[PDB]
Amino acid sequence: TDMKRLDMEIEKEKVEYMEKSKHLQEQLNELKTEIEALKLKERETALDILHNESKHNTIKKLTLQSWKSRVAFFEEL
Template identity: 50%
Template sequence: MYVLINRKRVEYLEKSKHLQDQLRELRSEIEVLKVGEKQTELDHLHEEQVRLGENKYSTLRKLANALVVLSSTAEDGEIE
């Protein structure tokens, strides 16, 4: 009798552990979906820029270089 009860207890604990793991996995999947639904177009653009290795410093560097080019072009008389 004790062996049967112990076996049932072990089965119950294994099933319980398995169900807890499944529940944890489903919760994390739901959280990912919730975050995805809340993202705006700007969030998606930011993710793409980060994926490409862009950040605010590289963007500022590009802007500074563009200003240098524009100012030198204006000094040469090409821009009025």
């Protein structure tokens, strides 16, 4: 009873997160495009250009590589 109630509370919270988040990503994208024509491409930084390529998402993908191979990779760099 209370457990089904908690699950629903949890789903509510989740929905709100995803909804606020989607809206935000959408506005960020709209704004970026809306001001692009005013951009001085000559002043673009490498960080900016390297950016046009979440932090947590990329981490999990690096975290999966085994310790042995990362070490071996590190020493080969």
